[PDB]
């Protein structure tokens, strides 16, 4: 769609603090597909309520481990490549 399916399928090793984040929402392993990483990040966002009804497409991650990892106070869920780059910054 924005990201190829072959890139979404690929297995990755989170760096230790992304690994902590994913573990906080039930993630049981040391390696994941990008698609699974993004599932748990979706669960983490939705669990911590890092959203606002006024701006329904923006994650509000300031003052959170997520904002520390991603290096931003907020971001758009429409910008997939930018989201992939912020996750690549947190893989071995």
Ligand X SMILES: CC(C)(O)c1cc(F)c2c(c1)C(=O)N(Cc1ccc(Cl)cn1)[C@@]2(OCC1(O)CC1)c1ccc(Cl)cc1
Residues 25-84 that bind ligand X (CB under 6 A): 38-39, 41-43, 45-46, 51, 56-57, 59, 77, 80, 83
Query: In the complex, which residue's CB is closest to ligand X?
Result: 42
State the minimum distance, in angstroms, from the CB of residue 40 to ligand X.
8
Residues 6+ apart with CB under 8 A from 9: 33, 34, 35
SS3 content of the chain, % helix, strand, coil (to 5): 45, 15, 40
Binding site for ligand X (CB under 6 A): 38-39, 41-43, 45-46, 51, 56-57, 59, 77, 80, 83
């Amino acid at each position: 769609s924005q990201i190829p399916a072959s890139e979404q399928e690929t297995l990755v090793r989170p760096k230790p603090l992304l690994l902590k984040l994913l573990k906080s929402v039930g993630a049981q392993k040391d390696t994941y597909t990008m698609k699974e990483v993004l599932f748990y990040l979706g669960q983490y966002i939705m669990t911590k309520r890092l959203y606002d009804a006024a701006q329904q497409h923006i994650v509000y991650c300031s003052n959170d481990l997520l904002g520390d990892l991603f290096g931003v106070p907020s971001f758009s869920v429409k910008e997939h490549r930018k989201i992939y780059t912020m996750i690549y910054r947190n893989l071995v």
